Ligand binder design. Structure first.
Ligand SMILES: O=C1C[C@@H](c2ccc(O)cc2)Oc2cc(O)ccc21
Length: 212
């Protein structure tokens, strides 16, 4: 009984299947990001986080039988989702048009702050973030356009870009670095991520699946 979610008219199917891996994922949660200007929240993108179907078996052990309220306050729960032994797929869709460099600037900012924060930001990670940036330079995201982050548990982050919301057939780049590979999702549902809309969805939707 996993539902779909719509954010500012951008729909996120309950399940999807990757053309690059052949795996299927279920929608863990959706939300929105933007900027607060003069006390006003200005929407720019929508975000949906998908978890590989096998994530349920992996998470069942420690989190089955926990209440949504209980999960929402347990940081360890989100750590297992971020670093769990399964693929995660994040789809960011634009509400307002942003060029590749415009969108990526803030994302890289947050990723770099996190990496430096946990003491894992050396030359390799800096070079990986440079490659990350490079991948976005030739892209533009008009309303409805999407970016796909495929977090592989093998320490690789795959980047895809779509003119709309459909999953690209091929990936535009592969960032091969363990620390950086989870940085993006970290800044969305990790401990130091202020917006809690995504964390709440995860806390609310997982319990049902973890039981069956
Ligand atoms: O989905 C987004 C939007 C993006 C953004 C919004 C407005 C803007 O002007 C530039 C970038 O910031 C982010 C930063 C992150 O760590 C993770 C996700 C996002």
């Amino acid at each position: 009984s996993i539902t779909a979610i719509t954010v500012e008219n951008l729909e996120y199917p309950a399940v999807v299947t990757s053309p690059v891996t052949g795996k299927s994922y279920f929608l863990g949660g959706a939300g929105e990001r933007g900027l607060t200007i003069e006390g006003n929240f200005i929407k720019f993108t929508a975000i949906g986080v998908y978890l590989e179907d096998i994530a349920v078996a992996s998470l069942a052990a420690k989190w089955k039988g926990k209440s949504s309220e209980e999960l929402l306050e347990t940081l360890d729960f989100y750590r297992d989702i971020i670093s769990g032994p399964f693929e995660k797929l994040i789809r960011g869709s634009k509400i307002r048009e942003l060029s590749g460099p415009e969108y990526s600037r803030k994302v890289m900012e947050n990723c770099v702050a996190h990496l430096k924060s946990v003491g894992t930001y050396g030359d390799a990670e800096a070079e990986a973030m440079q490659k990350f940036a490079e991948a976005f330079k030739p892209v533009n995201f008009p309303p409805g356009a999407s970016v796909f982050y495929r977090q592989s548990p093998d320490g690789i982050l795959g980047l895809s870009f779509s003119p709309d919301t459909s999953i690209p057939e091929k990936e535009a780049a592969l960032i091969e670095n363990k620390a950086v590979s989870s940085a993006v999702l970290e800044t969305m549902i990790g401990e130091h991520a202020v917006s809690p809309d995504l964390k709440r969805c995860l806390a609310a939707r997982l319990p049902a699946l973890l039981n069956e």
